[PDB]
């Protein structure tokens, strides 16, 4: 048990697990943290990648995946390298991840780090994947996915004993976060916690709907940079409830996106602005569109048209891109900017109650969790309170376990 760690990011991990004879590489998603060093669509916005210098991929056997938010690096791992193993994942996961992959490439061919990939790779990558359901035991050790409740297809993986928890929620619609299924283990890898540990989600949901309805009630336009799948659904089930309860009347909801029709499986879902959108475009309106990073996509067009008036408003909900640095290339600015990070993950008051119920022996988390946050360095509760102390790791490290 010598856990090679290829990426240091706490939310988009990359961990290789060495065993007696098997090797497992779980949760191999990209790091969009770098695509906003560049300028919007003077170069090509280039992406990061897990540090493959630690070990070759021709030795990796299997590649597990929990959820779609960390899969976009699957091309670089199974196509450009000599990877010749199988890949397991869940049915509603790959159905969604395929959708996000088509959006990204569509945005970029419109006109160590590596350039972006093309439609050729993703099809061959999304081919050699074997799909499973919850509790369907798979052999090799005997890995099996469970229910985390974070996203639609989002599974924790218990290897056999070593448990693995990444990006799990407890505030729910999906299948509940099971807890009895992952106790009595030797070690327990725990990654993917919330990144806004202080503010509750329910506060920020009421903060999204309130800044929205405050603008459209005053004759203004609201731009919401979001993904086509993920948090956008919880915004809409809350926005529908808000409109019915608070009484917002007759405001369009233009969900324009290159891949939007298959994205739902009075929200009009036009495919692009070049088309019948410019004709049926009534203001004041709301447009869930673009890419969160603001470095490409349709939002770059909207961000320029409306950005010259104090009545309009842009609201950020992706708790991954710092909205202050993702917005600098547009200054000077007159349009209000609001940060309303909706994040539904395991809070620190929630993770401890888990441990005092699951009761593992050893736990392992990145450096950013065994230390209080960089803002509230004094707050000692915003940290994994476990006994015995948790074995931390960093980027490009080899633990002993």
């Amino acid at each position: 048990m010598k856990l090679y760690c290829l990426s240091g990011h706490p939310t988009l991990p990359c961990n290789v697990l060495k065993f007696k004879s098997t090797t497992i590489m779980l949760d191999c998603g990209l790091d969009m943290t770098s695509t906003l060093n560049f300028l919007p669509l003077d170069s090509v916005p280039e992406f990061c990648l897990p540090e493959t210098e630690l070990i070759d991929l021709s030795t990796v056997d299997v590649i597990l995946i929990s959820n779609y938010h960390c899969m976009m690096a699957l091309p670089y791992i199974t196509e450009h390298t000599g990877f010749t193993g199988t890949v397991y994942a869940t049915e509603p996961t790959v159905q969604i991840g395929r959708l996000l992959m088509e959006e990204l490439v569509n945005f970029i061919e419109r006109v160590t780090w590596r350039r972006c990939y093309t439609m050729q790779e993703v099809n061959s990558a999304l081919s050699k994947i074997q799909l499973v359901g919850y509790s369907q035991k798979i052999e090799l050790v005997q890995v099996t996915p469970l229910s985390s409740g974070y996203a639609l297809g989002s599974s924790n993986w218990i290897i056999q004993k070593v448990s693995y928890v990444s990006g799990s929620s407890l505030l729910t619609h999906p299948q509940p976060m099971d807890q009895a299924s992952l106790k009595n283990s030797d070690v327990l890898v725990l990654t993917g916690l919330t990144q806004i540990p202080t503010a509750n989600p329910d506060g920020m949901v009421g903060e999204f709907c309130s800044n929205l309805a405050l603008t459209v009630r005053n004759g203004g336009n609201v731009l919401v940079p979001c993904y086509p799948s993920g948090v956008i659904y919880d915004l809409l089930e809350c926005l529908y409830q808000y409109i019915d309860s608070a009484g917002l009347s007759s405001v369009p909801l233009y969900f324009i996106s290159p891949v939007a029709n298959s994205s739902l499986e009075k929200l009009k879902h036009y495919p692009s602005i070049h088309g019948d959108f410019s004709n049926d475009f009534r203001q004041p309106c709301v447009v869930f569109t673009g890419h969160p990073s603001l470095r490409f996509g349709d939002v770059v067009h909207f961000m320029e048209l409306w950005g010259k008036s104090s009545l309009n408003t842009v609201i950020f909900t992706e708790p991954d891109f710092s909205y202050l640095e993702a917005l600098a290339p547009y200054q000077p600015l007159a349009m209000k900017c609001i940060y309303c990070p909706i994040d539904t993950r395991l809070n620190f008051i929630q993770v401890s109650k888990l441990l005092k119920e699951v009761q593992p022996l050893h736990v392992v988390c990145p450096e950013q969790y065994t230390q209080p946050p960089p803002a509230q360095s004094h707050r000692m509760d915003l940290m994994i309170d476990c006994q015995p102390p948790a074995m931390s790791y960093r980027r490009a490290e080899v633990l002993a376990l």
């Binding site: 202080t198 503010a199 509750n200 506060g203 920020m204 009421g206 903060e207 709907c209 309130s210 800044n211 309805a213 405050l214 009630r217 005053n218 808000y242 019915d244 309860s245 608070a246 009484g247 009347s249 309303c340 509230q376 004094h378 707050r379 000692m380 509760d381 915003l382």
Partner: protein, 718 residues
């Protein structure tokens, strides 16, 4: 009594004891037992028991049938007690061994019915009615009932157990006004204080608490000096047996200069040091409420009431018993601060306040517990760093602190306090993660701090420009109770500062009067009522949204609407308009048409209140009446006179009576005064001004409903 009820008594007594009919209704008995008290309290009782010799056979059957219900027994015991309250009836009820048979082992005491707490509560409340004269005093001593009450003061029913201790206190104080009864009681109490289990000690300390306070005669003074040695020896065990009962004794003793004149203040002073951090508070505040007290004691009282706050103020950048509790756990920390802020708030409005009352230091200690709760404090120790992890996001401590910070504004102080107070208040409003119950208190604290400042100076207008952008964000919250709370703030603020050129410049400059008007169509009915009231106020001040397109929008709600809350909120607005004076006849005529056609009793009642206001401004006289008949008032007042709601009929009765008076000191006045005289009003007023059950609550109709069963009528939900 009266002839209608009298002739119905013999049948009543027959059905109550008969074993074939179903058991009588428990509610009916209670409503019947209350009737007898009314009769006997104003007349003699022995005259009654002869004039109607059927009640005795009911009492006499109680110890013969051996199969009475469980609830007819209870009725009879309380009935035998309420009759034998006068000495004449107490003896007259003994020829045949009736009273010593009911409250003795022959009666419902020795049988297999002393198991239902209804009979026991009836036995105790039976004695308490008769124990009011010396003849009964001898009855309680000899046959033995004080020995029985001692066993009832341990019962498993708080309703019985606590009514027994209220009987010992009644027997004791009656015995002396030592005598026979008193000497046995004080012995059992004094023997209970020396017990080993808590329930026995609590039973004693509750008999003592009622003694001191209900009787200050100098025999009580002798009792305190004899028991003080044992009472003081209670603060020596590992757990003090009954702390909240112990504390309540010291306070009822202390608030009497008699008892306080040497061993009292020595125990009190020692209690403050040995009681835990759950009762030390309630005792330390009781001290500060008193005028007479050793100054060395109060200085120790106040200093143990401020101790939890003093620990927070030092563990943040600007006592082991306390520092342990605030860190022991989250429940105990939030527990100790919520009680301390409640106590220290019941203390401020008092004239016997401690002095000097620290104002500047308390506020700074209250503001620094709102930031810890909010989450933006700054530690200065490891106990301050542990405090941020506990108090952060605790709604119970944030509600307690926000009520206190609102109280700490009625004492005049420097403006440095106000700037520091509003600064932390405004942070609670412009913040996510404040619950709808915290936003209701932040909005109530912000209002007392504004209306208590030393036009509008140089600093208030700046806070306003910072504020109204936060009010716009709250009128759009996704909860009806927050959009409602922000419309009662905008109403009260505009009710005071409505005529200040500064407030009208910061209001209209923002988008508040436009959001306040798009809420006349909120789906929730409680927010239409608040929006209508705010527009009514905002338009009396001349601050309409940039004047009669409102009266057209309000009059639409009064007619075409679903709920009652907006409609009765519209009527209060139209009345305030007419009385203030914001074509008058056409106004009153249009409104009194939608009132009379309405279906709610509150909208019609305010209609006549809108008429009174208009009637007064009118009452040369011939047109005054002609105008008064043009609006249709007489059509309104007469229809409401014979109405299905007695509260609506009184308002119209009081209206015409006020109209029949003014029209005397001064169609035609002559003819209309006939129509006013033709119908009776004083007879109408006397009928309307009575309850709506003067027939169904009468003793006549109460009696008939008990002996005239035999229909379909069991108990279900309302």
């Amino acid at each position: 009594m009266d002839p209608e009820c009298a002739q119905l008594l013999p049948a009543l007594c027959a059905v109550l004891v008969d074993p074939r009919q179903p058991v009588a209704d428990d509610t009916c008995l209670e409503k019947l037992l209350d009737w007898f008290k009314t009769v006997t309290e104003g007349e003699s009782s022995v005259v009654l028991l002869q004039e109607h010799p059927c009640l005795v056979e009911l009492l006499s059957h109680v110890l013969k049938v051996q199969d009475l219900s469980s609830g007819v027994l209870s009725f009879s015991l309380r009935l035998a007690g309420t009759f034998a309250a006068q000495e004449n009836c107490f003896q007259y009820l003994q020829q045949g061994e009736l009273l010593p048979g009911l409250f003795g082992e022959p009666g419902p005491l020795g049988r297999a019915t002393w198991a239902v707490p209804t009979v026991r509560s009836g036995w105790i409340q039976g004695l308490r009615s008769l124990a009011q004269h010396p003849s009964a005093l001898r009855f309680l001593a000899d046959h033995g009932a004080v020995d029985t009450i001692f066993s009832l003061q341990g019962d498993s029913s708080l309703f019985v157990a606590s009514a027994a201790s209220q009987l010992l206190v009644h027997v004791l104080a009656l015995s002396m006004r030592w005598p026979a009864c008193a000497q046995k009681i004080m012995d059992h109490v004094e023997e209970s204080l020396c017990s080993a289990a808590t329930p026995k000690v609590t039973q004693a300390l509750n008999v003592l608490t009622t003694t001191f306070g209900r009787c200050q005669s100098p025999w009580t003074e002798a009792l305190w000096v004899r028991l003080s040695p044992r009472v003081a020896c209670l603060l020596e065990r590992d757990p003090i047996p009954a702390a909240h009962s112990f504390v309540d004794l010291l306070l009822c003793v202390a608030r009497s200069p008699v008892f306080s004149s040497g061993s009292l203040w020595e125990t009190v002073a020692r209690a403050l040091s040995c009681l835990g951090p759950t009762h030390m508070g309630p005792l330390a505040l009781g001290i500060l409420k008193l005028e007479h007290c050793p100054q060395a004691l109060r200085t120790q009282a106040f200093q143990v009431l401020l101790q939890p706050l003093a620990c927070v103020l030092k563990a943040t950048v600007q006592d082991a018993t306390t520092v342990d509790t605030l860190l022991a756990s989250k429940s105990s920390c939030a527990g100790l601060l919520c009680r301390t802020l409640a106590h220290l708030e019941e203390l401020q409005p008092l004239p016997q306040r401690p002095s000097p009352w620290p104002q500047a230091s308390l506020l700074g200690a209250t503001v620094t517990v709102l930031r810890l709760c909010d989450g933006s404090a700054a530690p200065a120790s490891s106990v301050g760093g542990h405090l941020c992890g506990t108090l952060a996001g605790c709604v119970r401590v944030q509600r307690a602190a926000l009520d206190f910070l609102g109280t700490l504004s009625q004492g005049t102080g420097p403006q440095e306090l106000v700037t520091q107070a509003l600064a932390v208040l405004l942070e609670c409003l412009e913040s996510p993660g404040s619950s709808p119950t915290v936003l209701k208190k932040a909005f109530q604290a912000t209002l007392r701090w504004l209306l208590s400042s030393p036009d509008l100076g140089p600093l208030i207008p700046q806070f306003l420009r910072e504020l109204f952008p936060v009010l716009q964000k709250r009128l759009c919250h996704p909860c009806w109770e927050v959009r409602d709370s922000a419309l009662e703030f905008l109403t009260q603020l505009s009710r005071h500062w409505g005529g200040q050129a500064d407030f009208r410049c910061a209001l209209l400059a923002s988008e508040v009067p436009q959001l306040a008007l798009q809420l006349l169509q909120d789906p929730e009915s409680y927010v239409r009522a608040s929006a209508v009231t705010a527009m009514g106020q905002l338009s009396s001040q001349g601050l309409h949204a940039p004047r009669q397109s409102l009266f057209l929008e309000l009059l639409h709600i009064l007619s075409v609407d679903s709920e009652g809350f907006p409609r009765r909120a519209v009527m209060q607005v139209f009345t305030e308009w007419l009385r203030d004076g914001h074509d008058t006849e056409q106004f009153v005529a249009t409104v009194l048409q939608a009132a009379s056609r309405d279906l709610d009793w509150e909208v019609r009642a305010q209609g006549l209140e809108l008429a009174l206001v208009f009637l007064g401004q009118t009452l040369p006289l011939t047109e005054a009446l002609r105008a008064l008949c043009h609006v249709g008032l007489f059509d309104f007042a007469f229809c409401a006179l014979f109405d299905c709601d007695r509260p609506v009929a009184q308002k119209s009765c009081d209206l015409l009576l006020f109209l029949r008076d003014k029209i005397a000191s001064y169609q035609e006045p002559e003819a209309v005064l006939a129509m006013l005289r033709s119908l009776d009003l004083e007879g109408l007023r006397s009928t309307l001004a009575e309850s709506s059950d003067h027939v169904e609550k009468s003793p006549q109709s109460l009696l008939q409903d008990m002996l005239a069963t035999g229909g379909f009528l069991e108990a279900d939900c309302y």
